[PDB]
């Protein structure tokens, strides 16, 4: 017997594990529609133009690789706050916030759950939608809080169960924590309507719950960043002090560089100066300081007028294309002769489609066509190219026929 003879084999990740499996397939026509990762119309990873140019200035500049403050690059930190909040914003104009650079959305989400475990003295309960992104569970559980659920999706009608959500939300105990997805709900692609949001805001404010916003797709829901931050701002402007996590993994295609941020909306500037210190105390014994590259890239872009403009034209370009892939898919399904209603494909927003396929179908998909998706029926439409939309339509159809 050794030290680790009792450590058993744990399973591959529900999501990430798909990329691993995909990797090993020898089928020349394999498609990885597992993770939410953008591909150009050639079905090739796409590094944004503004990104290529921002990296080049960094180089040109001959910058050091010295340790960053515990909290991250100030410029990035500040530029994020702003991207989330809006320049007009009183919250931002008053400095009543604390933004800390995190290890992308995941890392921010975690710093945040660990902050909460430590200082949220009113409850240990975090409420997640049904369904929610898989990683939300272990992130919160590992940080040490309890998990709960509120109704969200209605698979019978392929949309938001608003009456059920309102009922569940209306009964969450006061001062509990609720996780809401800012826009492009994962894995559903169905977000509450503006009017619906106004209503949720009321009940959240009414029940005095702490709103935890996960903002991983700003600019992917509508192709417009300010429109994507509506709901978030609407909440804060209603007097709800939220906490939020931002990812630059998809909107900037900085996936493996890992750039993100965790923000806390406080009552005052002084309150923020104290939350800040405790966040740093939290981060220090975790990874000490954050990865500089991704943050340097982001910041140069966010803070360089022409990089910001180009960035926005590119975020528009990526959303339009997913749209053109959605369109083409449904169209192909009818063309293959599909008797099914594929309306949700084009109804849904974001990088995926929550297709409704059963596990046997997902299974057949992988094995007969070398098409990889998650077991919940979620496909990354973001990863389809003009060249294989036909192939997918066909397979989806065969296994559905």
Ligand X SMILES: Cc1ncc(COP(=O)(O)O)c(CN[C@@](C)(CC(=O)O)C(=O)O)c1O
Binding site for substrate, by residue number, is 36, 133, 186, 378
Partner touching 133 among ligand X, its own copies, none, CB below 5 to 8 Å by kind: ligand X
Question: DSSP of 306-333, one letter per residue?
Answer: HHHHHHHHHHHHHHHHHHHHHHHHHHHH
Question: DSSP of 134-173, one letter per residue?
Answer: TTHHHHHHHHT-EEEEEE-EETTTTEE-HHHHHHHHHTSP
Is residue 288 within the footprint of its own copies (CB under 8 A)? yes
| Binding flags for ligand X, 27-66, as an x/- string (CB under 6 A) | --------xx------------------------------
Is residue 59 within the footprint of its own copies (CB under 8 A)? yes
Specify the residue, 119 or 363, whose C-beta has the smaller distance to its own copies. 119
| Residues 195-214 within binding reach of ligand X (CB under 6 A) | 214
Is residue 174 within the footprint of its own copies (CB under 8 A)? no
Specify the residue, 28 or 60, whose C-beta has the smaller distance to its own copies. 60
Q: What tokens appear for 180 in the block?
A: 């809401």
Residue 101 gets the label, from left (phi > 0), alpha (psi -120 to 50) or beta, of beta
| Residues 322-381 within binding reach of ligand X (CB under 6 A) | none
CB of 3 to its own copies, least distance (A): 6
Q: Which is nearest to 338 in space by CA: 325, 324, 357?
A: 357
Residues 6+ apart with CB under 8 A from 183: 191, 215, 217, 218, 220, 221, 222, 228, 229, 230, 231, 349, 350
Is residue 209 within the footprint of its own copies (CB under 8 A)? no
Task: Round to whole Å and give the CA distance between 303 and 65.
Answer: 20
Task: Round to whole Å and give the CA distance between 389 and 383.
Answer: 10
Partner touching 271 among ligand X, its own copies, none, CB below 5 to 8 Å by kind: its own copies
Among residues 214, 228, 311, 342, the one annotated as catalytic is 214
In the complex, the residues that contact ligand X under the rule CB under 6 A are: 15, 35-36, 104-106, 133, 135, 181, 186, 214, 216, 247, 249, 260, 288
> Which residues have a catalytic role annotated?
133, 214, 250
């Amino acid at each position: 017997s050794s030290w680790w003879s009792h450590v058993e084999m744990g399973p591959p990740d529900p999501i990430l594990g798909v990329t691993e499996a995909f990797k090993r397939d020898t089928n020349s026509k394999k498609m990885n529609l597992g993770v939410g990762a953008y591909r150009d119309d050639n079905g090739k990873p796409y590094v944004l133009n503004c990104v290529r140019k921002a990296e080049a200035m960094i180089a040109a500049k001959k910058m050091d690789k010295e340790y960053l403050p515990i909290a991250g690059l100030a410029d990035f930190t500040r530029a994020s706050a702003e991207l989330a909040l809006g320049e007009n914003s009183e919250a931002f104009k008053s400095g009543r916030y604390v933004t800390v650079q995190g290890i992308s959305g995941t890392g921010s989400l975690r710093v945040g759950a660990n902050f909460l475990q430590r200082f949220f003295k009113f409850s240990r309960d975090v409420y997640l939608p049904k369904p929610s992104w898989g990683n939300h569970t272990p992130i919160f559980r590992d940080a040490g809080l309890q998990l709960q659920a509120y109704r969200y999706y209605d698979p019978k009608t392929c949309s938001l169960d608003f009456t059920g959500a309102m009922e569940d939300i209306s009964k969450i105990p006061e001062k509990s924590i609720i996780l809401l997805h800012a826009c492009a709900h994962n894995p559903t692609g169905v977000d509450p309507r503006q009017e619906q949001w106004k209503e949720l805001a009321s009940v959240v404010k009414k029940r005095n719950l702490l709103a935890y916003f996960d903002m991983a797709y700003q600019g992917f829901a509508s192709g417009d960043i300010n429109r994507d931050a509506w709901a978030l701002r609407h909440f804060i402007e209603q007097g709800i002090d939220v906490v939020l996590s931002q990812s630059y993994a998809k909107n900037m295609g900085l996936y493996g560089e890992r750039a993100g941020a965790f923000t806390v909306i406080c009552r005052d500037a002084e309150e923020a100066k104290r939350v800040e210190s405790q966040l740093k105390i939290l981060i220090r014994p975790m990874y000490s300081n954050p990865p500089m590259n991704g943050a340097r890239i982001a910041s140069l872009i966010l803070n360089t007028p022409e990089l910001r403009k180009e960035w926005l034209v590119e975020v528009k370009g990526m959303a339009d294309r997913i749209i053109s892939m959605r369109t083409q898919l449904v169209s192909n399904l009818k063309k293959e002769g599909s008797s099914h209603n594929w309306q949700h494909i084009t109804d849904q927003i974001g990088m995926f489609c929550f297709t409704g396929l059963k596990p046997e179908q997902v299974e057949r998909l992988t094995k007969e066509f070398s098409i990889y998706m998650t077991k919940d029926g979620r496909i990354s439409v973001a990863g389809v190219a003009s060249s294989n939309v036909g192939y997918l339509a066909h397979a989806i159809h065969q296994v559905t026929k």
